Every structure is written in structure tokens, then in C-alpha cells.
């Protein structure tokens, strides 16, 4: 469970 990055 990570923190949402600025891209995908």
C-alpha cells in the first residue's frame, strides 16, 4: 500500500 504518485 503506497501513496499515490504524480503519474501512472
Amino acid at each position, epitope marked *: 500500500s503506497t*501513496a*499515490p504518485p*504524480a*503519474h*501512472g
Partner: antibody
Amino acid sequence: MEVKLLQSGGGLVQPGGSLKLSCAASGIDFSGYWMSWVRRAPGKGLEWIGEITPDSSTINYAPSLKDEFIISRDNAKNTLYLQMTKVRSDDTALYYCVSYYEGFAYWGQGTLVTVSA
Amino acid sequence: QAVVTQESALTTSPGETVTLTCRSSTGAVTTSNYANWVQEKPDHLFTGLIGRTNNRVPGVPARFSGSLIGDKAALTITGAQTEDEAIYFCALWYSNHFIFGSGTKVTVLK
């Protein structure tokens, strides 16, 4: 705890020198955050240096600066490292460490690097 | 590689609505560019506003909107306040790297 990113890095270096900046996190599970390095030049605007995943499996760099900067992290120490090798005059800038949360969420205070012989 | 372009500057009044654009030289700005909007207030104070085109950083007021207008990515400040007076940098993701824009000096008349 409140999120704080505390940078520690050199100041003055001469052309051809090397420096290693550190960014210690306190207030977040650093092990589950993407990290990134950006910089702000005196005249220029923001410039993206690079980013690194929580497990360090994928490290992305700006194509222009792939050979000058080396991004790493130690999740045990909750620390992010940027290594600048063989610098140039145009590297004089404020270097910032950013943590992603849907965007450029949490920032450090910035470290000044002055390159001059 | 690519050049990201946004307005040099904009001037607005408190309570009004302003819209900044972000242009890609490769073509139209799609959602696969994951537009990011970051603000720099005086004394080099950086704050993340928008990422992934539409997603606000948790804690950012809702007057900051991220959208796509035609070919470009867009940041909309609806009912701007004097504290929104800052330089707004746009950033576009090109598969493996971000490219930042020149910045837009937005002015809210104090």
C-alpha cells in the same frame, strides 16, 4: 506527528566537484512514498531532476541530466539522497526534495548549491 | 525533448475566476500526461496543487480545479483570493520523465 522533510546538503562547490544532498523524513511512512528531486535556478523556473519508487526498483531521470545526478534512498533511515558528480556553473540552484501524494505534495526547505571557481 | 508552454502572466481581481493553460509540443495534452500544477509564492515557497490532471493534493482548497481544455491542460482558480498570487508551474509526464513549464506569473490585485 506532522509531516516534515529536513534537507542537509553542502553549499559551495567548485566546477568538477561532487556533492551529496540528504532529505530525512519524519511524519510519514517513508517506506511507502514515491520520492523526487527538483531544483530552482536563479533565472530559470522549476526543473525536474528525477524520481524514485518506494522499493527503489524504478528510478527515472530527466533525459538531460541522467549522467550528472544519482538518486538513491534508505528507507531504514527514512532518508533520500541525491548525488551530483562533476558539477558545472549552471548547477547553481535551490535543490528541493518532494514526496508524491496525488501530486507534488510534501516539500523540504531546499538546499542551496553555489558552483563557482 | 518536448517543450511545455503556458502563459507568461495573467492579472485578475479578487473574487473573479482565472484559467491557466499548459501546452505540449508533441501534440494535444491527454490524460496520459498526468498534468501537475505547482505554485511558488514569494520567498521560494512551493506548494503542490494538482496532479494526475484532476486530483488535488489533500488539503488544497476546492477553488483550484484541474481540467483538460481542448489540446491543453488547465488550472482554474474560481473565486481567486490575494493569497493565490504566485507563479504557477505546469508539468507534463512523457512516459518516463516530467518536463516543467516556464511558469505563469498570476496576479491577484492587492
